Amino acid sequence: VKLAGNSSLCPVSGWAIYSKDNSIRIGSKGDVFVIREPFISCSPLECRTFFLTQGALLNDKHSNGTIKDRSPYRTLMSCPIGEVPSPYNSRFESVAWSASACHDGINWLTIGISGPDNGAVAVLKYNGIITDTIKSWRNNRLRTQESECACVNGSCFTVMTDGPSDGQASYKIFRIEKGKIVKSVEMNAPNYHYEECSCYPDSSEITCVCRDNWHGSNRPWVSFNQNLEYQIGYICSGIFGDNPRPNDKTGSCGPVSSNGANGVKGFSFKYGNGVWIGRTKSISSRNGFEMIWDPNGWTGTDNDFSIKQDIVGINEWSGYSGSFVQHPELTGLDCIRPCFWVELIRGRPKENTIWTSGSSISFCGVNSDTVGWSWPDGAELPFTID
Amino acid sequence: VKLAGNSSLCPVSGWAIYSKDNSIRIGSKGDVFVIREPFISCSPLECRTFFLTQGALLNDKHSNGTIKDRSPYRTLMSCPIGEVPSPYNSRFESVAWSASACHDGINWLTIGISGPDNGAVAVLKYNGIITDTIKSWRNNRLRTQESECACVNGSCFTVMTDGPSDGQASYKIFRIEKGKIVKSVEMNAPNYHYEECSCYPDSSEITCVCRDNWHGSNRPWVSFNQNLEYQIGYICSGIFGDNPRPNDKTGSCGPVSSNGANGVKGFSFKYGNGVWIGRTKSISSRNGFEMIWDPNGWTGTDNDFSIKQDIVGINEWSGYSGSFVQHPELTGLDCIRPCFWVELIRGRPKENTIWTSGSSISFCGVNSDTVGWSWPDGAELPFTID
Amino acid sequence: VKLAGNSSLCPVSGWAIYSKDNSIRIGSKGDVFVIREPFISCSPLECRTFFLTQGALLNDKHSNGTIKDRSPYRTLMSCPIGEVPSPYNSRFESVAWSASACHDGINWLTIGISGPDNGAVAVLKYNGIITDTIKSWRNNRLRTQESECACVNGSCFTVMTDGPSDGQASYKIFRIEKGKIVKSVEMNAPNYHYEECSCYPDSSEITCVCRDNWHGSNRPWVSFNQNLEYQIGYICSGIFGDNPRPNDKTGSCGPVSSNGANGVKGFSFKYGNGVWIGRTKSISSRNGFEMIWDPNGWTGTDNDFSIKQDIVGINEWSGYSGSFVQHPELTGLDCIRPCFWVELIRGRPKENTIWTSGSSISFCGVNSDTVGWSWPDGAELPFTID
Amino acid sequence: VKLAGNSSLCPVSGWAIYSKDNSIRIGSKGDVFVIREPFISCSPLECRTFFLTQGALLNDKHSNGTIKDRSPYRTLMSCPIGEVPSPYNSRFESVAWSASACHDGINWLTIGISGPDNGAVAVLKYNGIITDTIKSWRNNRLRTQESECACVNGSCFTVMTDGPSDGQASYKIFRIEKGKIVKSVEMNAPNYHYEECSCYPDSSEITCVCRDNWHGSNRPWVSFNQNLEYQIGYICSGIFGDNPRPNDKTGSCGPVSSNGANGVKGFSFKYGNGVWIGRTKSISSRNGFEMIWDPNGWTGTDNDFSIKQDIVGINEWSGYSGSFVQHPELTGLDCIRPCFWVELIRGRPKENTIWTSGSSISFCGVNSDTVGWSWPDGAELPFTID
Ligand SMILES: *[C@@H]1O[C@H](CO)[C@@H](O[C@@H]2O[C@H](CO)[C@@H](O)[C@H](O)[C@H]2NC(C)=O)[C@H](O)[C@H]1NC(C)=O
Ligand SMILES: *[C@@H]1O[C@H](CO)[C@@H](O[C@@H]2O[C@H](CO)[C@@H](O)[C@H](O)[C@H]2NC(C)=O)[C@H](O)[C@H]1NC(C)=O
Ligand SMILES: *[C@@H]1O[C@H](CO)[C@@H](O[C@@H]2O[C@H](CO)[C@@H](O)[C@H](O)[C@H]2NC(C)=O)[C@H](O)[C@H]1NC(C)=O
Ligand SMILES: *[C@@H]1O[C@H](CO)[C@@H](O[C@@H]2O[C@H](CO)[C@@H](O)[C@H](O)[C@H]2NC(C)=O)[C@H](O)[C@H]1NC(C)=O
Ligand SMILES: *[C@@H]1O[C@H](CO)[C@@H](O[C@@H]2O[C@H](CO)[C@@H](O)[C@H](O)[C@H]2NC(C)=O)[C@H](O)[C@H]1NC(C)=O
Ligand SMILES: *[C@@H]1O[C@H](CO)[C@@H](O[C@@H]2O[C@H](CO)[C@@H](O)[C@H](O)[C@H]2NC(C)=O)[C@H](O)[C@H]1NC(C)=O
Ligand SMILES: *[C@@H]1O[C@H](CO)[C@@H](O)[C@H](O)[C@H]1NC(C)=O
Ligand SMILES: *[C@@H]1O[C@H](CO)[C@@H](O)[C@H](O)[C@H]1NC(C)=O
Ligand SMILES: *[C@@H]1O[C@H](CO)[C@@H](O)[C@H](O)[C@H]1NC(C)=O
Ligand SMILES: *[C@@H]1O[C@H](CO)[C@@H](O)[C@H](O)[C@H]1NC(C)=O
Ligand SMILES: *[C@H]1O[C@H](CO)[C@@H](O)[C@H](O)[C@H]1NC(C)=O
Ligand SMILES: *[C@H]1O[C@H](CO)[C@@H](O)[C@H](O)[C@H]1NC(C)=O
Ligand SMILES: [Ca+2]
Ligand SMILES: [Ca+2]
Ligand SMILES: [Ca+2]
Ligand SMILES: [Ca+2]
């Protein structure tokens, strides 16, 4: 049966570890894909890890990072959560160098973008069958979430960006039913910048927390109903969630220009005026990870926080991170449980290898005892191929 | 339930990318079969990639291409679409050095031809159980589609050739129910030459577009009803569909003798007087691929065209290509969707290796926005074993 | 539903190739078990390949044939027919250095013998659960079929041997329901010798064709009803079915002493006074394979034959061979279809390697066009490990 | 449906071999995890082998045993019984360096403990969904069974220890329904020491046989009803069950201090005043294994016994061992069948390698004929990586 999506988020005091795949450790000898963007999404039966690959395995010559991000070889694929991304346990999903995926309760929806930078096409599959497409409307690198879309009552929702990572781009929200786009709207957001949105349902509404690559070191957000009537803003907290970023001062409800260029895929959970912020430990590099609870960090600008839980050690490698949810139809709970994944990037540019790949850890929000720690990748680099 | 097969082909203005397995890139380290003829066919539940193997893996000594094409080691096998053809994810189908496969809605039908050059036997399996055999009637390399067969109303249909690739041969159309041959007819086609037919259903009828290895650089066709009452011809378009071929001149509704010797497996879709032609970019070798819409190419002789969409770049390796359809019982559409696959041949004879294998890309016909590009194999040759 | 087993064997004029796994060819690089005794058995849903392994893979040091046949490491395992015996696609069945398996229509029965030579225990599993055991009654290498047992109307049947391979041993027939032995009888067979019986159902009765290791170069048989009331004899045909054997003279309805010592696992199909004999092409070594039809070879002693079909070339490697059937509950036929498998042994003692393993080919009996040929192993020995 | 758990243990006169995975032998070439604690547990449909991994494979550099036992990389995973623990056939369960698992009849319950030594958290999953957490209450290495938990009437039960392995610690019994902790009680057991409990159901009650790492060379026990009303004691038999241990003298119903320091995970089955003791053959190291029936060993102090059955030879490697049961809902029997597994440890500290891993053999209790033998690991050490 289709997901209702009408209950609020679960109250969450801590994050319990849910999975760890040890991809790069195992891939040293085993046949494991070189991957990026290991996002998680759940059906009413299971939870899956989606990822992007150049069609190359670790410790092989083809893992040579000479190929561009947006290449003809890049594919979206999925494996069971906690298992390694192997050609022997992965479903092929779509040919894509930018992707999104979500289950409406009946079938899997996957959004795969491929093609040239000046005319990329996003191909929509529902139950493995192509059901719709969209072409680039600004002819400048059509790109999407790199994490799960959000589904409420048989409609799934996503956000796409067309334009520069450098300045003003064009941002669109989409409403999708059974793989077919039934409504879309462009966001009136001058001076804002949206990339790689983490989106989730909450009381029949979707909230996305994204990445400003232009001039924001805090995170932009967009929230909308099913008719795509939206509000936009930035996370006001002085606890800045992007990377790179400055040290924590008083925040802003607009874009924080200080160290605002570049960014990393991220997420955050809104609870009234409060926010659960997932971010790196390092302000300048992709090192460490921590969950921080600010009871007024959504609308307030002060840099005060009450709860902080360690996820990845300051000296260890992290990277991309995204939100994912588990619905009452899967858990049997009365609310929608918030969860998150972290990509643990190893190799270039930070380390002396010829390749780059990411590990995967994930955590679920629970209202019971938890603990801070460090769950890093664990691979000993460089590898045999280097 | 049985596939009805009584609706028209879907109107198609473009081709969206459906799959890419990157199998040769992955097969550098991974345990992937050395394959040829990666044809796709679909059940009402899934789509599968069938292929032929010498029973050898990439980067192994057994992949040494000294063994003849019609060896006793050759086997037909299948794997899920977009995944690598590996011994760990492949389903064994039949012992064959020539094959065809299709799903009637209830069960899989596979046709595997093996045996000596002068007395080959086609073994027919319905649901993996041997249900019939056909013996070579002209004692000269009995051979079939290397592509999916077509099914209508609980009957599946195929074309088989017995005789030389050098001149006049014998061609038979077959009607199959539950894996049993219920009716066959020999085609009365002097001066014609049919090999490796790409066949598809359309309004309760089957259309095959084949390969003239004798004296034709345009593609021969045959079409028939359920009682096997047939018509024959060639594609009249000046846009020549075979390889090798001459440059585009005024076409012919018979065989075009210019560079008509030899060829490559191919396909085309008929829409009234018009034709969707898929072909290589080079006229001499198997390089590049493109889709061309000629509104008057089926029956008209001129070499004008409306639409052209790139698939594989001019300097990139292509090879075999074939058609497959998706029935409304799979898609929920009102028509039968045309799709196609391309084999991307790497190694001998063109490249300095000891082996030869094909990669896989597939596309499906949509009436929404698409884009031309190049989706090539991508493996760095030679390999360790070379 | 449970197999009736009450119809007669299918009339068979020829043998169509059913499978070929190319194990040793693929195992050169891939992770494939070193195997012996690749027998086939079928459930109403599928057909499976069972095999014995020392728990070692090809091209690995552990494949060193220093270990004895009846060791603690030997396990019975099964993989889908035509697929390679890999740790990634094989079900574990039982710890055994001698085995049998059959499906009664409801669940799998497996018989696994392990333990010391002077007190071996056969463990009976039904649906993976241990349901019964038998201990060695003569304390001399308790051993069984090395091929499928036979099931008629919810009772499965097998034959076990306890005693010397050198002279008179003890032979017992068993009746098994839901994995539990409900009746057994000892065979009153002085001067006879039974090892490695190939057994099949036929009109509610079981016929086994076995291997005389003592002093018979023709094959002994035993046939019985469901109450285990049995008849015994030898195949009278001058076309001798064992290996080693003499050249074809006039036969005997008793044991043929000439070249009677040693033997090979084999099979034969009784049709009234006639017999389908499967045997090697070489009289002294395990080379080649052929099917021979003698219209009076069961009860008559003359060495005349009307039909002969080549399976494996005279210069190629063969080995063990067994019978298997497909019931009307699987095929939809009115009779029980006879089929057979051949093990293609490579390595020691015949070849200069450190190991020994077998390939697998199988054939089904059909009443339509067939052909003789040679489908050999195909591996290039010696391997890297040697 | 829920497992009733209200019948008695089956009467058992011997142990028949159930499985052997030969994983270290296969892992020489194959891609097999370096594992510890290969405990077995059964659903009403299948039996599975759970295990812990550092996320490393055999013959890889990552298998370097310098990483601590309670690392962040440690994960609980499962595979079908008798198959190798491979990344290609293993199901991810939880992130854990200490674990327990059981099936209540409806769904799998897994318990995975991870986190820092001073604040470990037990994460409970029902059907793969986090349902509860328990935090370390004594802040000293919270740890559990390393063996299956026991389920009765839709409730599952486990034992957890918090405190030193050096002296007095804290021990708690837990009652779990649908993955939620409904009741727990602390054991009032001064002078006692419980670790790594092997627990099983019997007539609506649970009996655990554990490891005294403090000052006991005989095994401690605890037993309780559904309300967790418990009894405690030690196994009085002079046949000592732990390792290290002294030679068999007069026993004690309290802790036997002689060689009582340290130990190994083990199990035993209670039958009234009698006990089935599984133990190592050596008294100093982890070598050999045997089953012993002492008709008065549970409550009596003498060191006499009736039955003894060999499992692993005196000079062969053994290690951890634990109990698992098969309920009547799986077997169709009238009682609850006792079974057990043995871990076969190869490598450090005993052997000159860089790694440590365990093999797996399992046995089930039958009332029919059995035989003593030796079923050892069998791998030739050292390996290429050593
Ligand atoms: C990865 O790719 C790079 C770029 O193609 C390779 O760099 C080459 O290194 C050799 C050194 O002998 C030079 O001769 C080439 O000219 C380099 N190429 C370029 C474009 O500068 C590198 O060898 C590759 N690494 C692999 C395959 O492991
Ligand atoms: C194609 O054939 C299908 C199935 O044979 C037709 O659907 C049937 O149409 C008849 C006509 O009244 C109905 O009685 C049945 O209820 C239909 N069956 C199903 C399964 O739908 C369909 O009409 C045909 N379409 C055409 C002719 O275009
Ligand atoms: C592939 O097979 C061919 C032919 O069997 C091998 O070529 C041989 O190479 C030798 C020199 O090493 C030459 O004398 C001949 O041309 C070939 N021999 C024969 C008997 O034809 C080639 O070595 C093989 N490649 C492999 C196994 O990697
Ligand atoms: C297979 O096993 C045999 C027997 O153990 C090994 O033979 C040994 O060969 C070496 C040669 O240096 C001798 O030193 C040993 O004494 C031999 N053993 C015996 C019992 O004679 C052989 O090396 C093994 N092959 C492998 C592991 O590949
Ligand atoms: C063990 O418990 C089972 C299930 O609770 C008992 O079986 C039930 O017994 C009651 C008693 O009349 C019947 O009403 C039900 O029909 C039974 N249910 C099932 C599923 O069989 C069983 O009696 C108990 N066995 C004992 C007490 O030894
Ligand atoms: C396993 O890990 C250990 C410790 O990290 C490695 O041992 C090192 O070896 C060097 C000499 O090569 C010695 O100086 C030290 O004893 C160790 N170094 C450190 C920093 O502790 C060992 O090489 C590793 N084995 C592998 C990777 O195979
Ligand atoms: C959520 O939706 C379901 C189905 O529409 C409804 O039954 C339920 O009352 C809703 N829950 C709310 C509004 O809390
Ligand atoms: C929920 O689903 C029903 C069923 O289609 C739909 O009609 C209704 O609009 C929905 N309610 C929402 C979206 O709140
Ligand atoms: C075989 O058995 C079935 C069920 O017992 C019966 O219906 C059928 O008549 C039998 N076939 C024969 C005797 O030919
Ligand atoms: C076939 O099965 C029935 C059902 O159990 C049995 O009663 C009868 O004896 C059988 N008939 C045979 C074995 O011919
Ligand atoms: C074919 O479909 C069924 C199967 O034979 C038959 O009943 C029906 O009349 C036929 N329909 C056609 C030929 O369109
Ligand atoms: C436990 O089983 C069910 C579940 O609570 C309950 O109805 C029944 O009364 C109980 N039976 C016992 C404790 O034996
Ligand atoms: Ca930024
Ligand atoms: Ca041609
Ligand atoms: Ca003999
Ligand atoms: Ca102790």
JSON list of C-alpha atoms and ligand atoms in Angstrom, two decimals, chain A residues 60-67 348 354 385-386, chain B residues 380, ligand 1:
[
{"chain": "A", "resi": 60, "resn": "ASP", "atom": "CA", "xyz": [42.02, -2.14, -10.94]},
{"chain": "A", "resi": 61, "resn": "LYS", "atom": "CA", "xyz": [43.60, 0.19, -13.54]},
{"chain": "A", "resi": 62, "resn": "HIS", "atom": "CA", "xyz": [40.20, 1.58, -14.58]},
{"chain": "A", "resi": 63, "resn": "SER", "atom": "CA", "xyz": [39.78, 3.12, -11.14]},
{"chain": "A", "resi": 64, "resn": "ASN", "atom": "CA", "xyz": [42.20, 5.78, -12.46]},
{"chain": "A", "resi": 65, "resn": "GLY", "atom": "CA", "xyz": [40.43, 9.07, -11.68]},
{"chain": "A", "resi": 66, "resn": "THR", "atom": "CA", "xyz": [41.18, 10.55, -15.11]},
{"chain": "A", "resi": 67, "resn": "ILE", "atom": "CA", "xyz": [37.50, 10.31, -16.12]},
{"chain": "A", "resi": 348, "resn": "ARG", "atom": "CA", "xyz": [42.16, 11.84, -4.21]},
{"chain": "A", "resi": 354, "resn": "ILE", "atom": "CA", "xyz": [45.10, 7.24, -8.43]},
{"chain": "A", "resi": 385, "resn": "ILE", "atom": "CA", "xyz": [47.35, -0.39, -7.93]},
{"chain": "A", "resi": 386, "resn": "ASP", "atom": "CA", "xyz": [49.00, 2.87, -6.80]},
{"chain": "B", "resi": 380, "resn": "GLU", "atom": "CA", "xyz": [41.70, 0.63, -21.75]},
{"chain": "E", "resi": 1, "resn": "LIG", "atom": "C1", "xyz": [46.35, 7.04, -14.97]},
{"chain": "E", "resi": 1, "resn": "LIG", "atom": "O1", "xyz": [46.19, 7.88, -16.10]},
{"chain": "E", "resi": 1, "resn": "LIG", "atom": "C2", "xyz": [47.27, 8.78, -16.31]},
{"chain": "E", "resi": 1, "resn": "LIG", "atom": "C3", "xyz": [46.88, 9.75, -17.42]},
{"chain": "E", "resi": 1, "resn": "LIG", "atom": "O2", "xyz": [46.56, 9.05, -18.60]},
{"chain": "E", "resi": 1, "resn": "LIG", "atom": "C4", "xyz": [48.57, 8.02, -16.59]},
{"chain": "E", "resi": 1, "resn": "LIG", "atom": "O3", "xyz": [49.66, 8.94, -16.66]},
{"chain": "E", "resi": 1, "resn": "LIG", "atom": "C5", "xyz": [50.61, 8.57, -17.68]},
{"chain": "E", "resi": 1, "resn": "LIG", "atom": "O4", "xyz": [51.85, 8.16, -17.11]},
{"chain": "E", "resi": 1, "resn": "LIG", "atom": "C6", "xyz": [52.85, 7.71, -18.02]},
{"chain": "E", "resi": 1, "resn": "LIG", "atom": "C7", "xyz": [54.13, 7.41, -17.23]},
{"chain": "E", "resi": 1, "resn": "LIG", "atom": "O5", "xyz": [55.00, 6.60, -17.99]},
{"chain": "E", "resi": 1, "resn": "LIG", "atom": "C8", "xyz": [53.12, 8.74, -19.13]},
{"chain": "E", "resi": 1, "resn": "LIG", "atom": "O6", "xyz": [53.96, 8.19, -20.12]},
{"chain": "E", "resi": 1, "resn": "LIG", "atom": "C9", "xyz": [51.81, 9.19, -19.77]},
{"chain": "E", "resi": 1, "resn": "LIG", "atom": "O7", "xyz": [52.05, 10.19, -20.74]},
{"chain": "E", "resi": 1, "resn": "LIG", "atom": "C10", "xyz": [50.87, 9.70, -18.68]},
{"chain": "E", "resi": 1, "resn": "LIG", "atom": "N1", "xyz": [49.66, 10.23, -19.30]},
{"chain": "E", "resi": 1, "resn": "LIG", "atom": "C11", "xyz": [49.39, 11.54, -19.31]},
{"chain": "E", "resi": 1, "resn": "LIG", "atom": "C12", "xyz": [48.12, 11.97, -19.98]},
{"chain": "E", "resi": 1, "resn": "LIG", "atom": "O8", "xyz": [50.13, 12.38, -18.79]},
{"chain": "E", "resi": 1, "resn": "LIG", "atom": "C13", "xyz": [48.81, 6.95, -15.51]},
{"chain": "E", "resi": 1, "resn": "LIG", "atom": "O9", "xyz": [49.86, 6.08, -15.89]},
{"chain": "E", "resi": 1, "resn": "LIG", "atom": "C14", "xyz": [47.55, 6.13, -15.25]},
{"chain": "E", "resi": 1, "resn": "LIG", "atom": "N2", "xyz": [47.75, 5.18, -14.16]},
{"chain": "E", "resi": 1, "resn": "LIG", "atom": "C15", "xyz": [47.43, 3.88, -14.24]},
{"chain": "E", "resi": 1, "resn": "LIG", "atom": "C16", "xyz": [46.84, 3.34, -15.51]},
{"chain": "E", "resi": 1, "resn": "LIG", "atom": "O10", "xyz": [47.62, 3.11, -13.30]}
]
